[PDB]
Design a protein around this nucleic acid. Sequence first.
RNA 1: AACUAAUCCUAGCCCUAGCCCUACACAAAUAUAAUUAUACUAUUAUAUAAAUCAAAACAUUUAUCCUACUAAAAGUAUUGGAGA
Lengths: 95, 122, 88, 46, 68, 242
Amino acid sequence: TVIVERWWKVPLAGEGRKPHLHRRHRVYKLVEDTKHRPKDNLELILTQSVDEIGVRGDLVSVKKSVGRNKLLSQGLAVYASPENRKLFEEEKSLR
Amino acid sequence: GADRMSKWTSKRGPRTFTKSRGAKKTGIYTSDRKFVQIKEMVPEFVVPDLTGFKLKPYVNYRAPAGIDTPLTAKALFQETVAPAIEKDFKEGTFDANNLEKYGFEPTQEGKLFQLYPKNFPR
Amino acid sequence: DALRLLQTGQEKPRPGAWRRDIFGRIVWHKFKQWPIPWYLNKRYNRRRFFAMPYVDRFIRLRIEKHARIEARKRSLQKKKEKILHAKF
Amino acid sequence: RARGNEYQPSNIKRKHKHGWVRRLSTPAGVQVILRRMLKGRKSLSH
Amino acid sequence: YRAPPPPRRRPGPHSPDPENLLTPRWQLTPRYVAKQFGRHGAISGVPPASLWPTPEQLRELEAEEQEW
Amino acid sequence: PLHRYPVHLWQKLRLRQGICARLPAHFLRSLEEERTPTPVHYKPHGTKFKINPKNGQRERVEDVPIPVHYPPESQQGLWGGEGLILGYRYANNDKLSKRVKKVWKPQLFTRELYSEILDKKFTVTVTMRTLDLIDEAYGFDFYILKTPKEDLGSKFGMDLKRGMLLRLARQDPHLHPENPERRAAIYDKYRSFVIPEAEAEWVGLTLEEALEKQRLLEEKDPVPLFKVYVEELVQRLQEQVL
RNA sequence: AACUAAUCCUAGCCCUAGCCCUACACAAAUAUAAUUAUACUAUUAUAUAAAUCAAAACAUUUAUCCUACUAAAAGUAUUGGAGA
Ligand SMILES: [Mg+2]
Ligand SMILES: [Mg+2]
C-alpha cells in the first residue's frame, strides 16, 4: 500500500469538530510503499505428510506464496491458531 | 422562424407525417396493405323503446324538490342485504362461508361487467 | 361507486400508482391495457420512472421558490387588515 | 453573395435537432429542460 | 394604561430534552449537568456521587500525571 | 427566508418520518452511526502530545485522514480497505517547483477463495493487503464475520456476511447433507457469531433495498366492505340476543 | 381667451420575527417527430473544480468561494518566494 503525507500543516480542529481543508492540503509526499518491505513467513501446522517439509503436527515457517497456494488451498495444512495448536499437541502426547 | 407555440397536428409537416384526431380504431391492418374491419370493435347503441313514457325534459315549478342525500355504501347494504341476514340469524341458519347466497361475489373474473378494473364504458 | 366498494373495496375504477418521474416530481400514473406482460414489452421499457443524482439540486430550488411565494402572500394579508381596521 | 437567408426551413430537421425526444436522450439535454421549467418557460422544446 | 409585568429570569434547574433535534449540543454534556448542582444544590437531583471521577477515568488521570 | 432546520440535519429528519419510520429500530441505528475506518494510507499519531523541536514546548496533535476515491468496480470485489489516491506532488521534491497532478493506484490480483460455511469457491479481485488480513483472522470465513462494514468496504462482502449469519442462525441442514457429523463441527467452530434470525435478515442492506423489503411485507389487497359490515351486524345482533 | 401636455394613490414589493413537511389538482391524452387507445426496437450522473485576481511583472503562494455552536483566550502560539 502507498502511504502519503501532507506538505502543509493542518490547524487543530478541536474535540468533536473536523478540520476544514483547503486545496493546498491536497499536495502529498510518499513516505513508504509497503510492497518493498522485507517479506515475512507464515506459521502453519501440517495435517498430512508432505515431502521435504514435515509429516504431521509440526509447526513450519514457510514463504507466504507457498503456504497460500499449495498447503492451505489443497488442505494439506491448517492455520497455527491457538486452538489448532492445542488439539494437535494433545494428539501427539497421547500417541 | 418556426412557430413553437401552436399545436402539432397532421395538417402540418411533410406528407409522411400523419397522426389521429382521437377517433378509436375499428379494425386491423394486415400485410398486403389491406384494412380489415372487425364488427365487434364498432360500438353499438342500445336504444330503448320510448312509446308510452310519461317523463319529459322539464319539470313543473310546483314539484317539491327534496333534501339532498347522496347514496353511500352503508345505505345500500342496509336496504338490500341487511333484512335477509337478520331473519336468517334469528333462525340461526347463517354462516360466513355462504355470503354468496346473499349476493356477494368473491372475484370479478367471469363476469361480463367487471367492476374493477372496469371493462365497459359509460 | 357504492356497489364497487362493497364487492371489491377499491376507491377508483382505473388502476394506478404513485411514481417518481425523471424530473424529480411525484405523479399519479394511470395504467393502460396491454396484450402482453410488462417485462416483454420493449416500447414500455424505454420509459423511465426514476431520477438520477443531478436532479437533487433542482429539487431544492423548487422547494425554496415555493417558500418565497407563501411568505409574500401571508405578508400581504396582514397589511390589508391594517387598512381595514384603520378605516373601520 | 447576399446574406441574411441561412434559415431553409424543414420540419423533419427541426424536430430531430431540437425536439422533445432529442432533449431527453442525454443527461445534458435533460438539464436543459429543468432550467426552462424553473424559469417558467411556456415552451420547453420545439 | 398599566405596564405589563417586569421581565424576570426563569428560576430553577434546567433539563433540556435529549430527543429533540434542535436542542443545542452543549446543553447535553455532563459538564452542563454538573453546573446545575453547583448553582441549585440538592434541588437539581443530580446524584452527588457522579461528580467525582469514575474508576476508568481515574486510571487515565494518574497515567497522565506520571508521564508529564 | 430561512429553513427551519440546518441542511446537514435533513437526512436524519427524513428517516424520522414516513415509511422510513416503520423500519425496524436497530437497522436504522446501523445507518445512523458512522465510524471512521482504520487507517490504511496514512500513519496515525502514536501519542496525543509531542514536543515541538523549534520552541521545545508540548503541543497537541490530531489525526486527519486522507480522502480516498472508491471506484464502483471495488464493490464487486474484496479490496482490503484500499482505494485510489487523487492528489498533487511537487516536482523534484522541492516546494519551489511546479505542482503536478498525481494518482496512486492499488495493485489488483484475481484469486479464488473458499468459504466453509457456504461450501463454495468464488473468484474475486483482491489486493495483497486483503490476503494478509485473512491470515491474521485465521481463515476466509473469520475475516468476513469479524470485520465491520467500514473496514470491509465492499457491497459484495456485506452480502457474504448475510449469507453466513443466516446459515448459522437457522442451522440449515443444506450444509454437507448426509454428513451430520461434519456439519456439526463447522457450526460449532463459529458458535460465537450466532445472532437471532430476525436481525440477520437485514444485515448489509442499503436504504433502497430496505424500503422495497418493507413495502412487500405490508402490501395487501383491500377488504370488501361487504364482509366488514357483515361482521359489525353479526356482532351487534349476537350481543342483542344475549 | 389654447393646443400639445400636466396634477393623483394603490396594485404590489423589500427586510426581519415565527414555523419543518405530509399540496401529490374531475374525465381523457402524453416519453412515438411528447401530449397519437395495443406488441416491432431496451434502460443507467460524476475520478481532485479551474481561471480571472493579489504579489504593483511572474513561476511556490493569494481570506470568502471550499459551512459545523455564540463571547473570550487572540490577531497570541504557529505557517509563509519567512513576503504579499
Ligand atoms: Mg434571423
Ligand atoms: Mg500580479
